[PDB]
């Protein structure tokens with residue numbers, strides 16, 4: 118009696134979800150809903166179904182994983198699906214999370230369904246670890262760093278600079294700050310001390326390299342506040358070595374005991390494929406939502422409300438014997 | 442406001458006392474000791490003889506069992522659970538299933554809740570082993586225990602004839618640790634992951650030292666590890682081996698469909714191992730308090746508790762701040 122999963126959106130995350138479901142013997146992919154004309158997108162991928170027929174799958178989908186195609190509804194249609202299915206999404210706008218919760222909570226309850234919002238690595242796993250850290254060590258400081266990954270906005274920003282043909286940006290934690298955080302010494306970090314930015318640019322012929330470097334570095338709202346390095350490369354090297362699909366980060370709680378003893382907790386991720394990891398997280402949490410939906414849990418929930426036991430297909434006894 | 446009772450005043454109990462002070466929503470009702478009334482009125486404190494534990498019915502919300510002995514907890518845990526909600530750090534992994542059943546039976550019948558085996562391992566490390574396995578079902582989990590005392594093995598060596606007193610350390614092997622992190626995945630033998638270093642204060646007759654190295658051949662505890670053994674004086678052990686610091690690593694190295702290297706790591710660097718356990722116990726007491734009020738009964742483990750229950754903040758404050 119497999120868990121029937123439904124995927125909304127067939128972008129990198131939707132594709133990643135489909136893949137991860139193959140690593141989970143207790144799950145079955147029922148359908149992948151897409152806005153694209155599946156008449157063209159072929160026909161022999163039995164799973165593809167046009168988004169207009171989503172409603173027809175109310176009795177065949179236990180959990181719908183929202184992988185926002187890659188446009189507006191990628192922040193606007195959790196509500197529309199929630200009224201028909203139990204949902205799981207990775208809404209990542211931290212500032213608007215409180216509001217997303219309320220919206221999904223109303224719709225979820227009103228429909229007698231459960232909706233998991235803001236899961237993934239951050240929000241998601243990183244959130245859980247910040248929580249754990251400040252709960253276990255009430256006195257101390259939390260430090261989150263976002264490992265080497267691309268900042269889409271920044272790459273577009275770089276492309277706006279005169280003389281720049283193409284390019285990519287990376288935000289990278291500064292080892293100095295990581296070491297200090299990991300050491301027991303407490304401290305607050307300035308933006309400039311936590312992360313640096315590295316750009317790899319393909320210049321237009323001629324252009325003026327020293328000038329591009331300074332236009333990027335002094336760029337307000339993007340690089341001005343960070344130590345920024347600019348490397349010049351060819352289009353080939355960009356395509357070859359800057360796919361930009363990797364990422365990671367660190368969540369560190371530096372606390373002090375009562376007598377001044379230094380206690381440090383750390384959680385970190387090293388992901389060769391950011392999207393596929395987010396997808397794996399989405400899938401695991403689908404198992405939890407399915408379980409909670411059966412127990413009649415109603416409304417919206419975050420990773421903060423879910424016991425880790427629900428993420429596993431093993432029985433409580435098996436977990437206590439093998440992993441505790 | 443949450444009334445805490447501390448059972449046992451060893452290093453963990455002491456650590457719990459101080460940890461409670463770091464929590465505004467908590468209050469220490471009493472510290473229960475098994476020390477004879479052989480005292481100077483005590484020496485003054487929050488210390489109360491264990492025989493009076495029963496008098497605290499309906500004045501204590503959670504009894505944190507700080508005993509470091511899993512063997513004693515076998516019987517003591519059940520006794521307390523029949524009277525109060527409890528939280529313990531039963532650390533004998535092989536016997537957890539039994540401890541769980543016994544505490545479960547007892548707490549259920551008494552309408553109380555009993556959290557067993559919390560701390561850093563069992564506890565935090567257990568949670569991360571589960572998280573790793575669930576997130577990356579296709580991979581390998583590797584746990585290492587940073588440099589520090591292993592305690593059990595300290596008493597273990599204390600069984601070798603000729604050893605009066607001693608201490609033992611477990612130390613992760615950098616090579617194994619780095620490989621685990623690489624995401625290359627693989628299997629390590631016990632010997633490839635940790636090494637053991639002992640310091641022994643010997644003799645009962647200026648005993649045989651070559652034989653003392655009965656430690657190296659000791660099944661289970663040692664032998665599976667490259668174990669070094671140093672002989673020192675009681676004096677040396679006292680001033681140079683107060684093994685308080687410790688830590689460890691829990692790494693999940695996996696691959697997603699396609700071979701992409703994905704690595705998850707959780708680790709601890711603790712200057713005061715006992716006090717960290719104390720902090721963990723206290724935070725979990727809050728969750729147990731909350732659960733008890735919800736009518737939850739029976740035994741639970743860290744695996745059954747949502748992280749939100751560990752915080753005094755409101756569900757709204759957590760989403761606005763930490764999510």
Ligand SMILES: CC(C)CC(=O)C(=O)O
Pocket residue numbers: 267268269270271272
């Ligand atoms: C989704 C992107 C537009 C976010 C962004 O601005 C960035 O990553 O730099």
